[PDB]
Amino acid sequence: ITGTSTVGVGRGVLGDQKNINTTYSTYYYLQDNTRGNGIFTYDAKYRTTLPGSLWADADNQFFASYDAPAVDAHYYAGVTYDYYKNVHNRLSYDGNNAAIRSSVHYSQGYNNAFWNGSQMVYGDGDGQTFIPLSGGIDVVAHELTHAVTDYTAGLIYQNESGAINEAISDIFGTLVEFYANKNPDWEIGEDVYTPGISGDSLRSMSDPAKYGDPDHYSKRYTGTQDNGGVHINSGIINKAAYLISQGGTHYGVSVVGIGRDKLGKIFYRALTQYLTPTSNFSQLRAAAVQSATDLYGSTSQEVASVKQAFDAVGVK
Ligand SMILES: NC(=[NH2+])NCCC[C@@H](N)C(=O)O
Ligand SMILES: [Ca+2]
Ligand SMILES: [Ca+2]
Ligand SMILES: [Ca+2]
Ligand SMILES: [Ca+2]
Ligand SMILES: [Zn+2]
Numbered sequence: 411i412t413g414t415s416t417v418g419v420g421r422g423v424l425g426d427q428k429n430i431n432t433t434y435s436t437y438y439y440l441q442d443n444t445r446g447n448g449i450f451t452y453d454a455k456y457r458t459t460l461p462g463s464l465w466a467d468a469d470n471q472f473f474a475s476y477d478a479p480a481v482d483a484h485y486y487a488g489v490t491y492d493y494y495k496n497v498h499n500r501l502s503y504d505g506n507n508a509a510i511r512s513s514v515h516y517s518q519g520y521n522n523a524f525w526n527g528s529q530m531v532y533g534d535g536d537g538q539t540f541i542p543l544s545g546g547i548d549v550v551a552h553e554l555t556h557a558v559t560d561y562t563a564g565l566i567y568q569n570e571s572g573a574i575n576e577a578i579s580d581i582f583g584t585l586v587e588f589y590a591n592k593n594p595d596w597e598i599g600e601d602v603y604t605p606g607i608s609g610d611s612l613r614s615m616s617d618p619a620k621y622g623d624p625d626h627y628s629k630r631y632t633g634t635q636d637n638g639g640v641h642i643n644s645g646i647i648n649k650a651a652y653l654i655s656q657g658g659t660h661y662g663v664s665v666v667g668i669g670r671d672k673l674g675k676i677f678y679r680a681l682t683q684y685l686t687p688t689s690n691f692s693q694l695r696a697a698a699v700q701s702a703t704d705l706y707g708s709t710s711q712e713v714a715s716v717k718q719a720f721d722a723v724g725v726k
Pocket of ligand 5: 600603604606607
C-alpha cells in the first residue's frame with residue numbers, strides 16, 4: 411500500500427522482542443519498504459486461500475499471541491534478504507528486488523511451511539509436532555531459498571535434483587541462521603519442532619542419520635515416497651556440505667574443513683552458474699568442484715576439500 415515507512419515493535423513466536431519495519435496509512439501494515447520492492451506479510455486467518463489480507467494493526471505494537479507468527483515471518487524474511495544482499499550481492503530471490511510476500515496462520519494445525527512458486531506460507535503447527543513455523547529462522551530462510559533456486563538452477567522437485575533442491579535450502583537456511591548469530595547450529599527446525607522434547611530437530615546436517623536420513627550414497631532411498639526421497643536423500647548432500655565447512659572423517663574418508671563462508675560462496679556459485687533443472691548428485695559434485703576452482707584455484711585446498719567431502723558421502 412501507499413503510506414509512510416514506520417518502525418513497530420513486537421514479540422516473536424519464542425517470546426523475543428524485535429523491531430519491525432511497517433507502513434502507516436490509517437493502519438500500520440506489515441510492509442517493510444527498506445528492502446528492495448518491499449517485504450509484505452499477510453494473515454491467512456486459518457484458511458487455505460492465499461495470500462489473505464495484508465497484516466494491519468491499529469497501534470504498531472505486535473505483542474498479541476496471534477501476532478507472533480507474523481512478526482517472525484516478516485522479520486526473518488528481512489534477515490534472509492540481508493544475507494543474500496550483503497553476502498552474495500543478490501537483490502531478493504529474483505536478483506531484481508522482487509517483493510517478498512508471506513502468509514501466516516495458514517490452515518488449522520498445519521505442520522508445514524513452504525514456498526509455493528509465488529510466496530511463503532506458514533502453518534501454525536498443531537502445538538505438539540510444531541509451534542508456528544515462522545519461529546525458525548532456518549525454516550524461513552530454507553523457504554525463501556527455494557525461491558532463489560526457482561529463479562536460478564530451477565531444480566525439479568523430485569528424485570536427485572529434488573534432494574539437491576532441498577539440501578540447498580537447508581544449507582542456506584543454516585548459513586542465514588549463522589549470519590543472524592542467535593543459537594546457530596547445523597540442525598534444521600530445532601526452534602519450532604516438538605515443544606515437548608528438548609534437543610531434537612527435524613533434520614541434522616552434521617549427522618543426518620540421527621533421524622534416519624542417509625549420510626552416504628549407498629544408503630540412498632530409491633522408492634517413490636516423498637517425491638522420490640527429496641527430504642531423505644538431502645541428507646547425503648547436507649552431510650557433504652557440513653564436511654566441506656567443518657571437516658571431519660566420515661566412513662574412513664578425511665575432509666579438511668574450509669569454513670562456512672567459503673561453503674556459502676562455493677554453493678551459491680554452483681547454484682547460480684552450474685546447476686540445471688535435472689542435475690543429479692554427480693553433476694552437483696562437478697558443479698561444486700568447478701565453482702571452487704573459479705573462486706580459489708585448481709590447486710587450492712578448497713577444491714581438494716570439496717572432492718574429499720563428496721568422496722566421503724560416496725558421490726563421484
Ligand atoms: N524424526 C525426526 N526428527 N525427523 C525425521 C524426518 C527427517 C527428514 N527425512 C524429513 O524432514 O522428512
Ligand atoms: Ca497492535
Ligand atoms: Ca539454532
Ligand atoms: Ca538450525
Ligand atoms: Ca523439540
Ligand atoms: Zn524445502
